[PDB]
Design a protein around this motif. Structure first.
Motif, PDB file in Angstrom:
ATOM      1  N   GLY B 254       0.783  -1.219   0.000  1.00 23.81           N
ATOM      2  CA  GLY B 254       0.000   0.000   0.000  1.00 23.81           C
ATOM      3  C   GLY B 254       0.816   1.271   0.000  1.00 23.81           C
ATOM      4  O   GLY B 254       0.233   2.359  -0.039  1.00 23.81           O
ATOM      5  N   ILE B 255       2.143   1.173   0.045  1.00 24.17           N
ATOM      6  CA  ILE B 255       3.012   2.338  -0.056  1.00 24.17           C
ATOM      7  C   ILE B 255       2.923   2.885  -1.466  1.00 24.17           C
ATOM      8  O   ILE B 255       2.298   2.275  -2.340  1.00 24.17           O
ATOM      9  CB  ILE B 255       4.469   2.012   0.299  1.00 24.17           C
ATOM     10  CG1 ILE B 255       5.124   1.234  -0.842  1.00 24.17           C
ATOM     11  CG2 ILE B 255       4.537   1.271   1.589  1.00 24.17           C
ATOM     12  CD1 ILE B 255       6.505   0.740  -0.526  1.00 24.17           C
ATOM     13  N   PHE B 436       2.044  -7.151  -6.332  1.00 21.10           N
ATOM     14  CA  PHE B 436       2.661  -6.040  -5.612  1.00 21.10           C
ATOM     15  C   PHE B 436       4.156  -6.274  -5.431  1.00 21.10           C
ATOM     16  O   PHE B 436       4.970  -5.358  -5.610  1.00 21.10           O
ATOM     17  CB  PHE B 436       1.983  -5.826  -4.262  1.00 21.10           C
ATOM     18  CG  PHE B 436       0.689  -5.072  -4.344  1.00 21.10           C
ATOM     19  CD1 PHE B 436       0.596  -3.792  -3.841  1.00 21.10           C
ATOM     20  CD2 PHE B 436      -0.434  -5.646  -4.900  1.00 21.10           C
ATOM     21  CE1 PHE B 436      -0.586  -3.094  -3.904  1.00 21.10           C
ATOM     22  CE2 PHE B 436      -1.619  -4.953  -4.960  1.00 21.10           C
ATOM     23  CZ  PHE B 436      -1.694  -3.674  -4.463  1.00 21.10           C
ATOM     24  N   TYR B 440       7.285  -3.920  -6.768  1.00 19.30           N
ATOM     25  CA  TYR B 440       8.380  -3.469  -5.915  1.00 19.30           C
ATOM     26  C   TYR B 440       9.723  -3.952  -6.450  1.00 19.30           C
ATOM     27  O   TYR B 440      10.710  -3.204  -6.440  1.00 19.30           O
ATOM     28  CB  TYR B 440       8.169  -3.945  -4.478  1.00 19.30           C
ATOM     29  CG  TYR B 440       6.905  -3.441  -3.816  1.00 19.30           C
ATOM     30  CD1 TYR B 440       6.481  -3.966  -2.604  1.00 19.30           C
ATOM     31  CD2 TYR B 440       6.143  -2.435  -4.392  1.00 19.30           C
ATOM     32  CE1 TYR B 440       5.334  -3.513  -1.993  1.00 19.30           C
ATOM     33  CE2 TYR B 440       4.995  -1.978  -3.788  1.00 19.30           C
ATOM     34  CZ  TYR B 440       4.596  -2.518  -2.589  1.00 19.30           C
ATOM     35  OH  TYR B 440       3.450  -2.060  -1.987  1.00 19.30           O
TER      36      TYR B 440
HETATM   37 CL   LIG Z   1       2.180  -0.818  -3.033  1.00 22.83          CL
END
Ligand SMILES: [Cl-]
Ligand SMILES: CCCCNc1cc(C(=O)O)cc(S(N)(=O)=O)c1Oc1ccccc1
Ligand SMILES: CCCCNc1cc(C(=O)O)cc(S(N)(=O)=O)c1Oc1ccccc1
Ligand SMILES: [Cl-]
Ligand SMILES: [K+]
Ligand SMILES: [K+]
Lengths: 871, 871
Positions: B254-255, B436, B440
């Motif tokens: 969620g970053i 996700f 990243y």
């Molecule tokens: Cl994220």
């Protein structure tokens, strides 16, 4: 001589000197410029390869391998070993049929194929491996003879010592027979081969000849139920299939024992292929045939005893032993007498005359040992001749009419004797087997690597070698050495890597056209091609600089400074213009190319030396700027040293220098000028005019490097008074958007102000000898003097260039007052309109601005968009 | 304009057009040549990242994770997830602080960092991942509300359907609140964050506030023995540590939910770093603190019942439950009421007001879902704006005063609704978690790749990002997605590779300065450097040819023929000399460079286009031969098309052509001349003079290629009669040692014989207009005409060049008679002494020899040792 001559073999001979008095090629300038024992393939590579392959396993342990692993699986073992061996044979044939191979064996092939690194590494490993395989074969003979003289009671000492005694005596004899030339030992291996083939024939005939005396034993004489039973892999308590393959594979090695004799062969590149491949074919056929025959002829276990009666009592007897007779039937309870899995001398008894098979074992062992003992020192002396390891500069003299490594023979004899008296051959066996595997792996990798680099000189004479089979062979060799004693494989890889590192850090000064060199060229070419397809973009701009070094020795620290903001980033082409007659200057360039390129590589200057021949410096540099580079590696910046000697140099030369400036500007090149004291903590940048961003990119790239990483990059600009704070803030935000991590921005309003009288009078004194003093001699003498450019137009060129000079001198004074403490200074290069300013006046501008200061880079950019703050 | 101007931000703006009327840079030619809502970091990237991280796990399943895995090991789980997340945060910060980021989020960063391939691939994957994470968060809210309305009896349908109903209604509401601009939903997330922090504070206060009503439950209020017991990893029947980490990690993601808002942030490259990193810090601190608190405050299992009395009967009770009280003690026999491992609502009851924590769950779930639902369409519309996938040319219009992807919002709403009503979120969870992870991983690889290619334009503003930590982060992301559902990781890698392939075969016509481009340049440069250190050798010679193509369109099949014996072997530089005024020709070269280089790359011509500006063709090619190339990639052969038009061309031009020949000879260049019919099965080679081996190497390399692989290479030579067999055998052995697999060697004695009258009279007729007829006008008119070279010296140049012409014509006749059936002909190029032969006569020689024939290559070599039979 004068006229061109028809091609002859003599032209391409001896490659430095080979009958050069006869059939010498005429040089292009001459046409254009106006005015003792040698062995054939049968007895040199076929007999030796066949006779080296055939060793202990054929006559001793083969009955064991076919007894435990099934016939249909023992043949699989033999076939896998033969796939490895035959693929290596094709690879060796491909390597050997390329050129004319001087001497040595696998060492010379691998070395001359892909470089002294792998060459020396694997050559040393193979020399050691053969030297100790001598000990392995001879101790196998020792076991044979001690078994014979223990079955026949008479013995001298304990077996573990009688083997040592007999092995030492017979290895001494092997040295003696081998050290006496190669005709003698060639005939010796001929007679050994005759004996071995007599033994093979005796076994075949005896196998076709059954008898009742051997009936109690496993011998039955081609009974179908025996074959049906033996097809299965009836293993033992410990031996698994991989262990079985490990036992067998030493029997597969020994090929290219003729290739190791390449130095003494009458005609290589025609004997090696059809000797090695045919020998592998024959030996594999014999192994497979004898294995299936002995599997189909004898049974697993046999309680050998006449009391074991063929009466065949009516019992179940699921085992097929009683199917032939009650003798040698149902002994599985206790360990019964002997058989395939319970005896080794089966090979002896299934045949006819036991002596005529025993002689087979002795002949096989001696012949294999002698072949290895001849092959090892040839490889070693070839390796020592190239002096890859200078410590062994001996072992290469080779006394005798035919060069024979006497010292090599003695060394391999000592190694073999040491490993005999160690008497621990069982524990050392996997190490040496996978040294052989490593050598085979590098041969197949030799071929694969050679085919991978196009290299028009690769072109072997022997087909049937395609690259993928060689790659498969290298992979299979690696996998097999993992199968054989994994940690031995790790040790072998460590030894290979260690020798590779040792050689690549030694860098022996020798060139024999490695495939590594071809691969280097092809790789660099392919990446230049892919670069040619990469479109330009601002944030991938690189300063790729053509530096008019002259001789790269002439200005070393200038070269270092340019290398600082071009190392690992952008290009650096050290251009040097040669002069004078074309013919002499060709040789001049030819020697300077090698000398200076090696000098750069030695001094870790990742640069490119580009010599050109030209009438003068200006149009030589014109050549370089127009054409140097490749694809998008063409230079985009011209770097000059400030011509410090202009006060003494001929004024035509400095005019040439300034017109060099002008040409660089004309063909859309940024210009960097470096003035530093060449006799030999903040980067100050005064970039007063928007060159396009290069005057920022140079100091930033300097800060990137380790040498200047710990040095601030403070910046100076010029701006109108009463807008000082506004200009400073705009400057800060501008190059903070450029991410140039400044340390202090200074804004100067003293620019465009008249400098002191002392500095102006000094500049006037400097320019006086060239201002042409256009006061008298209105037009006639004036135009006559002006017929040559390098004088300053007094009246015309000091009207607005008066304030140009004023700004120049005052800027110099400001650098003195502010930036004199800098480690380096980067400032905007003044630009003069082409032809509007006398070259003398422009050079005087540069002198006045740049004098008496720390290192200066007078950077003027392309006026493109070098820097960006987008993404 | 006329005078150079001080640098200003306006010069570097809009990169195609940005306020170009004001602050426009003066061009170098001009100087030289003579004559609507934006969010701050607090409310735009800090609040959103914090509020997206905090989701279901914080308030529902965290008590479970700290209960099963020990406190000292749950903190290890949180710390590992935070290491991955924080390393990705540093990587994202490094990427975001490079330039000015237009719009979108992770897509724009990764794309503009390392190319549209990874950009589009991972951008599509991330857009899908956020679109469905919307469904995941909202169904978590659905589970919360259904649990609340099932504990409170009133229910409408079965749980597995009531969750669907409530999730659909509330995702519709989420669309409504998000589709109404970003000020409104920004304030909405502000109030949600207030609610969430109130819930956190209520839990902390309640945890400090113990009571007897909750005493029967696991709640005890910071008892030391409870902490000592809970430190251990008391797992369950199935859940292992890796499964525990798999459960937790979705809470770590969620970053860069603020980074996805980069298009609407007031100031990126300053909000992204200190928003994302600070949000990660705060959220990790809160997770760790709340985990240790709830672990130290509640016990594993609790038979919650007032009947469970604290009377504490004197028993052993090894469990530390009775250490506090007999209540909630020794329930391990059957499944007791609840606790950390037996309940989820612990978070609700340990606090004070149960509603004030329930509101915490609803606020966390809604806020995370809304953040994801805003972030996904921004990424999607940025991806669609670049048109990497033209199918989605929609979803990018963005109606509204501030560009808002209405279509993107609708699409992500439909995807979220579909995955809600699928109601199979548990099985889809690992797929999306490691999407996700993949995003990243490509962000950290973005930074590592950028730092690997020097690229002076990389230079990010944000430090604390070193390359090795980013590489470690990419590796950790890969390993973690292996940990989470290995086959899901394989599927994710397959999707990434498939999208990569799709894009790299689409090749979108766009350039934004990828790090891939920088790496391409740096790699090609490094391999050119290593080539510069590779010494020359005969058997690594390559024909690396400068081909005077002119425009590469002008002679296509000539270009193909040269490319045939230079593809994958040696170099090919297509030189083109431009003409006329310097200023116009600069732009001429600039456009032709792009046009012809793209034309070559498109047509699979692995060549290099080299344009030069020069006064005429001769000295332009002089430029090219002197300076073209880089290191040891400089050309060594000059390739020309036969100037077919010489009968019509201006005689000065053909004189220039012949002097081009002579210059190539003078600077030690082999020359190849190709005469073929350009309007558009044996290789015949008549190599009568030993050029050095090039006349062999060219046809052999032709045979190497697939196009000519099925074509024999038969050879012809000349020799004196009565030595025909000797010469043929010597020739055969000579080039069998050269391994040139000939097919038939023919020996000709008809050479050096006077050819027929018809051919000689034809040649005389051709040469008549230029033989100068040096019969009359003894010296005055003769020397006056000879003041210009291009006439043939009748008397002087036909004394021995008479027999030269005779051999030329007779050779032509022989090629007609013998080699007219060849697919290609390669013959020795005649060489004339410099200045001794009129250029007209030499061109006539070439015409006479080469006319009326199949394709011809008139090869003359360097007279070096091009071929060898050594190794
Ligand atoms: Cl994220
Ligand atoms: C690279 C192979 C070096 C030779 N070693 C070898 C050769 C042969 C053969 O027949 O060529 C058979 C065997 S064996 N006993 O079957 O495994 C061999 O292993 C030995 C031999 C004796 C002592 C210790 C190991
Ligand atoms: C990439 C993460 C996507 C969101 N999924 C998610 C987020 C959080 C959190 O708190 O951010 C916690 C969990 S969970 N139940 O603890 O594993 C999550 O897994 C779910 C949630 C509900 C349905 C199915 C899977
Ligand atoms: Cl071998
Ligand atoms: K052997
Ligand atoms: K989250």
């Amino acid at each position: 001589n004068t006229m061109d001559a028809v091609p002859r073999i003599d032209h391409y001979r001896h490659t430095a000197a080979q009958l050069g008095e006869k059939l010498l090629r005429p040089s292009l300038a001459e046409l254009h410029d106006e005015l003792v024992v040698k062995f054939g393939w049968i007895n040199g590579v076929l007999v030796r390869c066949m006779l080296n392959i055939w060793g202990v396993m054929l006559f001793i342990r083969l009955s064991w391998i076919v007894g435990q692993a099934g016939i249909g699986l023992s043949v699989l073992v033999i076939m896998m070993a033969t796939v490895v061996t035959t693929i290596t044979g094709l690879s060796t044939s491909a390597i050997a049929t390329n050129g004319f191979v001087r001497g040595g064996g696998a060492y010379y092939l691998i070395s001359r194929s892909l470089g002294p690194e792998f060459g020396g590494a694997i050559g040393l490993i193979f020399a050691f491996a053969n030297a100790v395989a001598v000990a392995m074969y001879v101790v196998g003979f020792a076991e044979t003879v001690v078994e014979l003289l223990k079955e026949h009671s008479i013995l001298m000492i304990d077996e573990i010592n009688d083997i040592r005694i007999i092995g030492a005596i017979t290895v001494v004899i092997l040295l003696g027979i081998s050290v006496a030339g190669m005709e003698w030992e060639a005939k010796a291996q001929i007679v050994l081969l005759v004996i071995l083939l007599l033994a093979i024939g005796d076994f075949v005939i005896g196998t076709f000849i059954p008898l009742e005396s051997k009936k109690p034993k496993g011998f039955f004489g081609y009974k179908s139920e025996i074959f049906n039973e033996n097809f299965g892999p009836d293993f033992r308590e410990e031996e698994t299939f991989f262990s079985v393959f490990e036992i067998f594979f030493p029997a597969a090695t020994g090929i290219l024992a003729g290739a190791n004799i390449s130095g003494d062969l009458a005609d290589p590149q025609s004997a090696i292929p059809k000797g090695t491949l045919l020998a592998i074919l024959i030996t594999t056929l014999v192994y497979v045939g004898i294995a299936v025959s002995v599997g189909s002829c004898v049974v697993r276990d046999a309680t050998g005893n006449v009391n074991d009666t063929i009466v065949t009592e009516l019992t179940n007897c699921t085992s097929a032993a009683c199917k032939l007779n009650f003798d040698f039937s149902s002994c599985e309870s206790s360990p019964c007498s002997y058989g395939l899995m319970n005896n080794f001398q089966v090979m002896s008894m299934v045949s006819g005359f036991t002596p005529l098979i025993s002689a087979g074992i002795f002949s096989a062992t001696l012949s294999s040992a002698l072949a290895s003992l001849v092959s090892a020192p040839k490889i070693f002396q070839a390796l020592c001749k190239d002096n890859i390891y200078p410590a062994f500069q001996m072992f290469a003299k080779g006394y005798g009419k035919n060069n024979e490594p006497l010292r090599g023979y003695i060394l391999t004899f000592l190694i073999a004797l040491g490993f005999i008296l160690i008497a621990e051959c069982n524990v050392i066996a996997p190490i040496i087997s996978n040294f052989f595997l490593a050598s085979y792996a590098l041969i197949n990798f030799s071929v694969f690597h050679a085919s991978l680099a196009k290299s028009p000189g690769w072109r072997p004479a022997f087909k049937y070698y395609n690259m993928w089979i060689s790659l498969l062979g290298a992979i299979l060799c690696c996998i097999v050495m993992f199968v054989i004693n994994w940690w031995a494989a790790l040790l072998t890889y460590v030894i290979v890597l260690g020798l590779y590192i040792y050689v690549t850090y030694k860098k022996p000064d020798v060139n024999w056209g490695s495939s590594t060199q071809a691969l280097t060229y092809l790789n660099a070419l392919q990446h230049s091609i892919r670069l040619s397809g990469v479109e330009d973009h601002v944030k991938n701009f690189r300063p790729q600089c053509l530096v008019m070094t002259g001789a790269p020795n002439s200005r070393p620290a200038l070269l270092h400074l340019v290398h600082d903001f071009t190392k690992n980033v952008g290009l650096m082409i050290c251009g040097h213009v040669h002069m004078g007659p074309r013919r002499q200057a060709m040789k001049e360039m030819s020697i300077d190319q090698a000398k200076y390129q090696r000098w750069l590589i030695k001094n870790k200057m990742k640069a490119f030396y580009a010599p050109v021949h030209a009438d003068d410096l200006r149009e030589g540099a014109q050549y370089l700027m127009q054409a140097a580079g490749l694809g998008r590696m063409k230079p985009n910046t011209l770097v000059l040293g400030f011509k410090k000697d202009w006060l003494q140099a001929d004024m035509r030369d400095v005019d040439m220098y300034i017109n060099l400036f002008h040409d660089a500007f004309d063909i859309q090149y940024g210009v960097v000028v470096i003035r530093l004291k060449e006799g030999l903590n903040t980067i100050d940048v005064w970039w007063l005019f928007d060159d396009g961003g290069l005057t920022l990119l140079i100091p930033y790239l300097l800060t990137t490097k380790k040498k200047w990483k710990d040095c601030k990059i403070r910046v100076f600009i010029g701006g109108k008074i009463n807008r000082i704070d506004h200009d400073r803030r705009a400057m800060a935000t501008l190059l903070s958007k450029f991410r140039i991590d400044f340390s202090d921005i200074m804004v100067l309003g003293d620019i465009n102000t008249k400098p002191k009288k002392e500095n102006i009078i000094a500049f006037e004194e400097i320019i006086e000898p060239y201002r042409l003093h256009e006061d008298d001699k209105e037009q006639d003498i004036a135009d006559k003097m002006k017929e040559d450019e390098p004088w300053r137009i007094t009246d015309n060129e000091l009207e607005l260039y008066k304030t140009k000079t004023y700004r120049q001198i005052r800027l110099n004074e400001l650098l003195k007052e502010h930036s004199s403490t800098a480690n380096i200074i980067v400032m905007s290069l003044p630009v003069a309109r082409k032809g509007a300013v006398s070259s003398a006046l422009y050079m005087a501008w540069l002198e006045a601005l740049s004098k008496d200061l720390p290192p200066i880079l007078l950077v003027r950019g392309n006026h493109q968009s070098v820097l960006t703050f987008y993404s």
